[PDB]
A paper describes a structure:
Calsequestrin (Casq) is considered to be the major Ca2+-storage/buffer protein within the sarcoplasmic reticulum (SR) of both cardiac and skeletal muscle, where it resides as either its cardiac (Casq2) or skeletal (Casq1) isoform. Casq binds Ca2+ with a capacity roughly equivalent to a half of its total negative charge and an overall dissociation constant of ~1 mM. When studied in solution, Casq polymerizes as free Ca2+ concentrations increase and depolymerizes as Ca2+ concentrations decrease. We also showed that both glycosylation and phosphorylation alter the physical characteristics of Casq substantially, including its oligomerization and Ca2+-binding capacity.
Low-Ca2+ native bovine Casq1 crystallized in the P1 space group and contained four molecules in the unit cell; the resolution of its diffraction data was 2.74 Å, whereas low-Ca2+ recombinant bovine Casq1 crystallized in the C2221 space group and contained one molecule in the asymmetric unit, with a resolution of 1.88 Å. Both high-Ca2+ native and recombinant bovine Casq1 crystallized in the C2221 space group with three molecules in the asymmetric unit at resolutions of 2.60 and 2.14 Å, respectively. On the other hand, the three molecules in the high-Ca2+ asymmetric unit of native and recombinant corresponded to one-half of a linear hexamer. Residues Glu244 through His250 normally form a loop stabilized by hydrogen bonds, a salt bridge (between Arg223 and Glu244) and hydrophobic interactions of Leu246 with nearby residues. In monomer B of the high-Ca2+ recombinant Casq1, however, this loop was deformed upon binding of one Ca2+ ion by the carboxylate sidechains of Asp245 and Asp247 and the backbone carbonyl group of Ile249. Consequently, the bound Ca2+ ion displaced the sidechain of Leu246 and swung it outward across the back-to-back interface and into a hydrophobic pocket formed by Ala20, Tyr23, Ala82 and Val83 of chain A. The Ca2+-dependent loop deformation also forced the backbone carbonyl of Gly248, which hydrogen bonds with the backbone amide of Val317 located in the middle of the N-linked glycosylation consensus sequence (316NVT318), downward against the glycosylation loop, which shifted the glycosylation loop accordingly. The net effect of the outward shift of α12 in monomer A and the Leu246-mediated, Ca2+-dependent hydrophobic interaction between monomers A and B was a break of the back-to-back symmetry.
Residue numbers in the entry:
A (entry chain A), B (entry chain A): 4 to 349
């Protein structure tokens, strides 16, 4: 009645020109680890075996749900990788229907399975009644969309659902057919509002009713939020998406009163500067990455039991941190704005 | 710049009558896995080696923070185990100061390290100003206490801090010296309010000012909340604490609009029946245990993409689940009360 342990059945194989058509046929959803060939030393061999074991456990856990896992060698299987669109080494590409979803997060069985379980869900969630509306409003650490349509047979709803599939499961798409919900949201019929992460005010997609292409192009242009949360499921995607080799990194434990107070200041600063295309802040809650906390404290020379904020230069592997005597020496929004300005324009 | 990998240094040893005094001296905080001797078959041997490797990784991660890990064989080391108070096999006993903290949760390096990082924090958190007060009010999935005292030198504050140590890190103790915060909480000087998990209304500890013993005895009597959340850090403690071999188990994904709506009904039912000593509901959010979701769906024969609630008989290894056609066929509070009554008084 406990966590599953690998049962030794070989379910994850190398996916190559000989078998790839049969593997895609065997599984309704197929997730492919695109990897460089392991080096020949024993350490690199062991790590490769341990990585495969992670996939084996996930494949066992999800067998009855139509999910399969495979591995594609970027050298041996280069031709198949190209035909399938596998280009970023160490990414897992998830094939659902007509979509190819890139996973670029923690390589662990639990996080992988949680992601696949999100992939298997439908790309549009409905909102009806006050409690469901409250659930929608509680979402803030993701970009989200909500649109008001006549009903599920509306061509405009179907275009919205088709657009949701492009960003699944990263950007939740919500829909309502309830005119009372739409009024509380100030959504006119066939209007779509995009709520950037951590923002209070939405941006309405122009020129409604909107086609799939109009929604997709809009979401792609607003995909990067001023403030974004580092999450295990997407940690490497976020970290690799630096702006001119610079991240602003804020550490704050949401549940701690001092972390909450600092996070509220951070949100206020992001909201007041949300249209500055050069501002990108990563919020890391230490409680989400316990195994990295000592490493971050050593690397950055900071105490993560208190809120911290700094500028990390990925190009030069260097960083500077705002000097805060303790948890009670937090900057005002204005002081935080000014400190970022001083370090960046410099 | 990534998750740590075990470096092969042996930091976790068997703790026995010969070395236990030196181990306790080597480490400021020491966590001891109390385990039955591994069976001699190769499978049991491998599992024991894999368990030790989990401790090795945690010990590496926390080395610079004064934490050590050890293992105590319940047969070979029975005399030392008794002297140290190790009685429940498969529990990890954490020695901090004068306290012995039992860990009875997921045996994984990340969850273990997160718990130890919580252990290392101070047992009382202060509340000052409106934002910190809001952080206090946002806490609902734990029992919590808050007391109003003159200042940190008050003998009554010191008694409160001494009591907090007994329940650290499971039941957060908050304190304020701010008369404006105390007024919003309706806390008179030296009063202590206990907020049961998921309850709106607190219970004031009687006969203030309160001694350590009065607080400890009060908290012990109110320790078990009507509604409690299954969490990795304490999942086995919670599951083993059944009431006459019965758990009421509710599955609800907090972030999903249907899960939120059902959870609100569950909270309302718990609040209206909070004084019924026979009512104990475990809320499991599937998003917290992805690796167990397929196992639960198979074992209970339910769809965990929708909210579910049932009665699980641990004695007879049997369960019954409320029949809900889909996510929109949710019971009212009254219907849920009546359904529990019908299945239990039967
Ligand atoms: Ca294999
Ligand atoms: Ca497409
Ligand atoms: Ca990557
Ligand atoms: Ca986990
Ligand atoms: Ca509007
Ligand atoms: Ca249009
Ligand atoms: Ca990527
Ligand atoms: Ca704090
Ligand atoms: Ca504080
Ligand atoms: Ca913005
Ligand atoms: Ca955590
Ligand atoms: Ca923590
Ligand atoms: Ca403060
Ligand atoms: Ca060892
Ligand atoms: Ca004691
Ligand atoms: Ca136990
Ligand atoms: Ca983890
Ligand atoms: Ca009161
Ligand atoms: Ca008293
Ligand atoms: Ca226990
Ligand atoms: Ca739903
Ligand atoms: Ca619904
Ligand atoms: Ca109660
Ligand atoms: Ca989760
Ligand atoms: Ca989920
Ligand atoms: Ca509903």
């Amino acid at each position: 009645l406990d966590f599953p342990e690998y049962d030794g059945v070989d379910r994850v194989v190398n996916v190559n020109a000989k078998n790839y058509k049969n593997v895609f046929k065997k599984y309704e959803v197929l997730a492919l680890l695109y990897h460089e060939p392991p080096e020949d030393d024993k350490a690199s061999q062991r790590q490769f075996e341990m990585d495969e074991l992670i996939l084996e456990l996930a494949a066992q856990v999800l067998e009855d749900k139509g999910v399969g896992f495979g591995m594609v060698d970027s050298e041996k299987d280069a031709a198949v990788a190209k035909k399938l669109g596998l280009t970023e080494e160490d990414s897992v590409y998830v094939f659902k229907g007509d979509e190819v979803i890139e996973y670029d997060g923690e390589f662990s069985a639990d996080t992988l399975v949680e992601f696949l379980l999100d992939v298997l869900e439908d790309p549009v969630e409905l909102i009806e009644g006050e409690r469901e509306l409250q659930a929608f409003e509680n979402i803030e650490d993701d970009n989200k969309l909500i649109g008001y349509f006549k009903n599920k047979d509306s061509e405009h709803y179907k275009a919205y659902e088709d657009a949701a599939e492009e960003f699944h499961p990263y950007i939740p798409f919500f829909a309502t057919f309830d005119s009372k919900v739409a009024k509380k949201l100030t959504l006119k019929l066939n209007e779509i509002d995009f709520y950037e992460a951590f923002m209070e005010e939405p941006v309405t997609i122009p020129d409604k009713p909107n086609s799939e292409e109009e929604i997709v192009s809009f979401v792609e242009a607003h995909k990067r939020s001023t403030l974004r949360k580092l999450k295990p499921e997407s940690m490497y995607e976020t970290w690799e998406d630096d702006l001119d080799g610079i991240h602003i990194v804020a550490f704050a434990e949401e549940t701690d009163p001092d972390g909450y107070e600092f996070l509220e200041t951070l949100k206020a600063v992001a909201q007041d500067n949300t249209d500055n295309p050069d501002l990108s802040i990563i919020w890391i809650d230490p409680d989400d990455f316990p195994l990295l906390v000592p490493y971050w404290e050593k690397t950055f020379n900071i105490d993560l039991s208190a809120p911290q904020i700094g500028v990390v230069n990925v190009t030069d592997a260097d960083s500077v941190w705002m000097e805060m005597d303790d948890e009670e020496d937090l900057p005002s929004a204005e002081e935080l704005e000014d400190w970022l300005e001083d370090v960046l324009e410099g």
